[PDB]
Amino acid sequence: GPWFTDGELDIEFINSLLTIVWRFISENTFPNGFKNFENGPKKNVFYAPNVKNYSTTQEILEFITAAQVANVELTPSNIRSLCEVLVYDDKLEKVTHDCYRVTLESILQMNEEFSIFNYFKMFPASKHDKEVVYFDEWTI
Amino acid sequence: KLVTPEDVMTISSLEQRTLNPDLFLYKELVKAHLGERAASVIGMLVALGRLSVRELVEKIDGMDVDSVKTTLVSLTQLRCVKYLQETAISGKKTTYYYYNEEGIHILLYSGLIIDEIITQMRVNDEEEHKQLVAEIVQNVISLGSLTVEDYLSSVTSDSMKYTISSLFVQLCEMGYLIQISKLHYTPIEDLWQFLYEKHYKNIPRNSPLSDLKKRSQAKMNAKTDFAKIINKPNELSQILTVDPKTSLRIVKPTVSLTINLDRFMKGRRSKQLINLAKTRVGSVTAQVYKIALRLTEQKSPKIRDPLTQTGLLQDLEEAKSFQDEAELVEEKTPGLTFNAIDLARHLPAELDLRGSLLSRKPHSASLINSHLKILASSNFPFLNETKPGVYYVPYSKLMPVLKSSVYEYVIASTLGPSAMRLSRCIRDNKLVSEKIINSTALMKEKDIRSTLASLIRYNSVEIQEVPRTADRSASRAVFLFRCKETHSYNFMRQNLEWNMANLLFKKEKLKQENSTLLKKANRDDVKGRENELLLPSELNQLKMVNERELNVFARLSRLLSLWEVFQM
Amino acid sequence: NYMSNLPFGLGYGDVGKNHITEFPSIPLPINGPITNKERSLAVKYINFGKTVKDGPFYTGSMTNDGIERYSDKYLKKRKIGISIDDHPYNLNLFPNELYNVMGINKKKLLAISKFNNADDVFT
């Protein structure tokens, strides 16, 4: 595809393209993209199950064509591959072939009882703390 | 600068890295709660398997028969040692003592158990039942098993005795306290072997059935008898007695009650599923799922099927039979299916459900149905539909998803999100090459190589070498990558056990180092007056020691929330 | 020579040191600050450990001079502690060989601890 620049991938273009695709799908699936999540925990709404909140591949291709960010033609295989890259990151999920929907965890990641999934909210331990648990330990 | 091997052996955990996590954890817990004698006995039983009293005497230096018998009594009362009495052909009878993870996990989960008991029965309204529930559960866990009459013999107030009896009945009704018996002290494998041999002998000799037919019939009879024996604790046979005065249900006086670990692990699994659902479907829908799981929790399937510990999985047909039986019991149990009308009565006053849904781009049944349909239509199988409007939790299909999600997010938190991406990429298409990874997962090749090299060290990615020469040289062969779930899950379970054990070891070392100051501070006259009766330096040392101990226990709780998923 | 061949990614400058640290550098997110619920859970842990430490089932580690003084009177006894044979055992749960050390015919007292309501840990 067009990702190869001088024989290697251009990670900045990858990040920008993935971010704009994820934002488009986030605007599709939620009632208002990144609007209800402001003042989120008290007042946030979601779509009814009968609502087709999923965004198909054709809509994403049309949006990225009209956005003029890619600057080249995009085969549906290419947008499908980068959306597979997104679903590998757990940013979104696939419910039907050529259909995707943004997961709520990716929305919460941009900004109580302990959970492993909200690990970004946790703060690192202060220095000179002896009783700190390391994942690399027992293997080093 | 350079660090000497003296400094490495002193300030690091190199000496503890060579210990098995099971033995290290069990010995540390027993040495922390009980003494060093019980720690030696438990460690020797873990290292050598089942042992007799004579073997324990001859294997441990510094202990005689009476000391070993006394510490075995102490361990057996707290249910840390299982036993089996067997008779040889010559007629000699010998008792062989095992170790059971149930009692050690009870010691490990004790404060979590007390908190779950306090929170679960909705005594959050006021204070006196908070005191009584906490004290009775703490006494039950500390003494292993106690009778209600012996507990009430220490109370002189009639109203207090009545409230304690009512609270004991309330605990017994909802499955948290059960009747202790010899079933909780005999091994599962030995019980199944006894049942299978008994049902094998009862088959008449010179039968028309072949050997395999006899084995199958014996297995069926052993399975139904084993199911009856296992479920016999949960039939509420200790509560049927009514008091001499009418209109009061009481627990039997002479029965011995014990804490039920399976119900507590069911509650922990429910909490894990609620936490998983909080990251996929909203917060109000998370509350609805929470209420649904709390309602269908006592009758939910057990965390581990005991028949899986009987060595019966060597037959593939037995594995399929166990899977089908699990799928059947998670669905056709009468108390597991639920409707919106059933959940309508259990919703709290604060929960609203009014404006939580938009249909187009007061605890009513339709809103609950919409929330449960959102739960059922999610990518994760939180709920499934048997018939339309009836919902049940798919415990057979939801728990590998929970394990995979927890494992992937732990890797994301430790090794980075790129590690999550690479692991899920290798998982989605099962066997891949480096170029296929680079094409499918869009990131730099050197980053791919470094990330998979890091992931290989933790059993996350296994290298499959395909040789292209007569000798399997690494230069000419091609290396593909696959992701085996079981190896990685077992490795991380062992790692979390080692981390928990090392944390407990550090806490015990700190307490042993500051023992004099902690003994001075914990005295009856000193306590409550630490500022007046202690020097400022000793006060600051006590400050640091107690803060470090609280941090140790908090990290232990957080590890336990992260480790029980792989014990499911 | 054994030194000539190098991988493409590496160079001569960055190899030949072999400094593998003995100290880990990848922490879990569980090392955050403690909360109120976690503080109550921790003091529950401490209370349970203490109440098992001084209970009848401890079995601990494996100046009482023989000289007699008049100061022996007016000096109180330390503690009449509960022993292993002063507990109401359920004899159906124990093997027959352990009956000798439990005192099957002795006085029976149930050591019931009292729950500490307040988080008495000095911060």
Curated annotation (Swiss-Prot), chain A:
Organism domain of life: Eukaryota
Family in the record: Belongs to the eukaryotic RPC34/RPC39 RNA polymerase subunit family.
Compartment annotation: Nucleus
Annotated source species: Saccharomyces cerevisiae (strain ATCC 204508 / S288c) (Baker's yeast)
This protein's name: DNA-directed RNA polymerase III subunit RPC6
Record text on subunit structure and interactions: Component of the RNA polymerase III (Pol III) complex consisting of 17 subunits. Interacts with BRF1/TDS4.
Annotated function: DNA-dependent RNA polymerase catalyzes the transcription of DNA into RNA using the four ribonucleoside triphosphates as substrates. Specific peripheric component of RNA polymerase III which synthesizes small RNAs, such as 5S rRNA and tRNAs. Involved in recruitment of Pol III to the preinitiation complex. Involved in the configuration of an initiation-competent form of RNA polymerase.
From Swiss-Prot, chain B:
Superkingdom classification of source: Eukaryota
Region: Leucine-zipper, residue numbers: 496-517
Example of a GO cellular component annotation carried by this entry: nucleus
GO BP annotations, alphabetical order: termination of RNA polymerase III transcription; transcription by RNA polymerase III; transcription initiation at RNA polymerase III promoter; tRNA transcription by RNA polymerase III
Major localisation: cytoplasm
Job description of the protein: DNA-dependent RNA polymerase catalyzes the transcription of DNA into RNA using the four ribonucleoside triphosphates as substrates. Specific core component of RNA polymerase III which synthesizes small RNAs, such as 5S rRNA and tRNAs.
Protein name: DNA-directed RNA polymerase III subunit RPC3
Protein species of origin: Saccharomyces cerevisiae (strain ATCC 204508 / S288c)
From Swiss-Prot, chain C:
Assembly: Component of the RNA polymerase III (Pol III) complex consisting of 17 subunits.
Entry's localization field: Nucleus
Top-rank taxon, per record: Eukaryota
Protein name: DNA-directed RNA polymerase III subunit RPC7
Family under the similarity heading: Belongs to the eukaryotic RPC7 RNA polymerase subunit family.
Signal sequence bounds: none
Organism lineage string: Eukaryota, Fungi, Dikarya, Ascomycota, Saccharomycotina
Record's function text: DNA-dependent RNA polymerase catalyzes the transcription of DNA into RNA using the four ribonucleoside triphosphates as substrates. Specific peripheric component of RNA polymerase III which synthesizes small RNAs, such as 5S rRNA and tRNAs. C31 is involved in the formation of the initiation complex.
Coiled coil: none
Gene it is expressed from: RPC31
First-to-last residue of the parent protein present: 14 to 161 of 251
Extra remark: The acidic domain is essential for its function.
